[PDB]
């Protein structure tokens with residue numbers, strides 16, 4: 001049994017992580033400069049809150065989590081370093097949460113956010129109230145529970161993030177592989193691709209890689225993935241395809257083909273083939289997890305944007 | 306629920322992996338060219354054994370495991386590739402086993418084997434009958450159970466192995482970091498060191514890094530490990546130290562100092578300060594796991610070599 005201490009626990013990227021760790025049964029302390037509604041919610045849920053930073057606050061902690069809005073001069077951080085308490089950046093603790101849950105990592109250079117929201121919206125329609133991560137922030141749409149209560153944790157996987165390769169998902173999506181973040185990889189696009197292969201191999205052999213074969217780069221690395229995979233796209237050779245794409249208003253309709261299933265007519269309130277692809281990835285994941293066709297349709301058509 | 310198929314299941318590096326997966330509840334099939342006692346033991350334990358390689362054997366498998374003693378021309382492998390069944394090398398399935406167990410990964414360029422044996426010998430003295438991996442082979446000293454029955458899985462972590470960075474231990478040792486395998490890292494010793502840092506960061510924040518600070522390279526990367534660590538060595542600043550090293554026969558005696566513990570007198574039937582260091586790493590791990598001083602002494606003094 002361990003105690004995590006958050007430096008700046010009221011920060012908006014930190015509060016959610018604290019509430020999940022409370023939900024997992026850890027002792028959670030935290031320091032902030034201003035008491036707020038957030039720090040009182042955390043206290044109502046079991047967290048020990050301190051106001052103002054002073055080295056005593058870090059006493060007893062087995063780990064420190066520090067935002068990027070903290071200085072090494074901060075007394076608690078300095079005390080932790082002197083006592084050899086490990087100090088972990090906000091983003092790494094966030095990625096670790098996936099080890100305690102059925103993690104669905106949504107990777108890809110673009111469309112991570114929309115695909116994560118669509119997944120959460122479908123799972124919610126199937127009664128699963130999943131916790132999901134968008135832009136470093138934990139949410140659970142209309143949850144009446146603590147963050148993390150669901151079995152399911154759906155998260156953006158950013159290839160530019162230091163923790164990209166420390167995610168431990170059960171399921172991983174790759175929407176596409178662009179060159180926006182070659183900088184993170186010494187400016188070499190081929191090293192960027194090798195990183196997506198390494199990421200998909202953090203999947204266990206019972207896991208699932210959901211791959212957009214409409215991206216030539218994804219199709220290129222596909223033979224390297226020694227994990228169960230399901231492909232999607234408009235490509236006639238994808239496992240899960242969209243056909244008869246049509247419009248009635250700002251609502252896109254299409255028909256999804258799935259192996260050993262009857263064609264399903266869906267609609268999403270979003271334009272452009274890239275959001276059809278984001279729907280297809282969601283349909284692939286929701287179908288693997290066993291969610292009904294009715295919840296898939298309701299989840300997709302309800303999402304606003 | 307999944308079925309794993311082993312190509313060459315009688316192979317000595319493969320049989321142990323098959324028996325662990327049986328113990329974890331998976332369906333396990335396997336093909337070999339000769340029936341042997343090994344293949345009958347696997348069948349007694351639940352495995353479907355086929356003799357001679359033919360594509361039908363791979364039917365129904367959700368994954369294939371293939372040794373290095375197989376050809377891509379092998380019909381089962383070829384059938385799996387055509388049907389898109391993932392094909393996994395023996396060494397990767399072996400590293401995955403650690404995800405199902407309380408994994409203790411023994412890394413370091415030298416002394417992995419002796420330290421793994423010492424750990425297993427101490428845990429056995431404490432009644433834990435651990436499964437352990439030496440040279441790619443699963444053992445459980447005098448077990449009366451299937452491989453994998455123990456909660457504990459103790460394994461060598463070879464920095465030259467492709468799966469080094471896909472181990473998911475609860476505890477990791479690093480005995481030392483030499484330059485024997487720079488070849489694996491493009492011949493750059495500094496890239497070799499960065500790999501040990503990345504490896505230790507596959508530890509969860511509740512895990513433990515057991516680090517030999519008598520190696521200057523280990524001491525160099527220590528400030529980079531944002532995980533709980535315990536250090537060992539003769540260095541006067543190590544957490545767990547050996548002192549009053551003495552001899553009576555081919556048996557080395559010494560006294561172990563531990564934080565907030567009384568000094569413990571141990572002995573090991575092995576010469577040289579490097580096997581004192583291997584004992585210290587074992588004592589660190591056995592002390593973390595809560596094993597009694599009596600089992601530690603009995604485990605260490607009983608080990609032969």
Ligand SMILES: Cc1sc2nc(CSc3ncccc3C(=O)O)nc(N)c2c1C
Nearest residue numbers: 176213214215216233234272273274277
């Ligand atoms: C700002 C935006 S929106 C957007 N949407 C797409 C969609 S690509 C695509 N769509 C559908 C089917 C196949 C493919 C493919 O060729 O793989 N691509 C982009 N590059 C962008 C950018 C730069």
Ligand SMILES: Cc1sc2nc(CSc3ncccc3C(=O)O)nc(N)c2c1C
Nearest residue numbers: 110111175176177178212214215274277
């Ligand atoms: C197969 C597919 S789908 C797809 N969708 C996008 C979307 S890009 C984008 N979207 C939304 C907002 C901004 C941007 C941007 O570019 O700033 N990009 C791609 N490269 C692909 C590929 C290869």
Ligand SMILES: Cc1sc2nc(CSc3ncccc3C(=O)O)nc(N)c2c1C
Nearest residue numbers: 481518519520521538539577578579582
């Ligand atoms: C064939 C062998 S046996 C052996 N044993 C040691 C031991 S090193 C050592 N021992 C004790 C305390 C500190 C240290 C240290 O200086 O970290 N080092 C080696 N290089 C070898 C080789 C090449």
Ligand SMILES: Cc1sc2nc(CSc3ncccc3C(=O)O)nc(N)c2c1C
Nearest residue numbers: 415416480481482483517519520579582
């Ligand atoms: C702190 C320590 S302990 C230690 N122990 C060894 C052992 S090397 C070795 N052992 C056994 C058999 C062969 C060999 C070999 O070298 O072939 N090497 C080291 N570099 C260290 C360090 C830096």
Ligand SMILES: [Cl-]
Nearest residue numbers: 086087530531
């Ligand atoms: Cl640190």
Ligand SMILES: [Cl-]
Nearest residue numbers: 225226391392
């Ligand atoms: Cl493969």
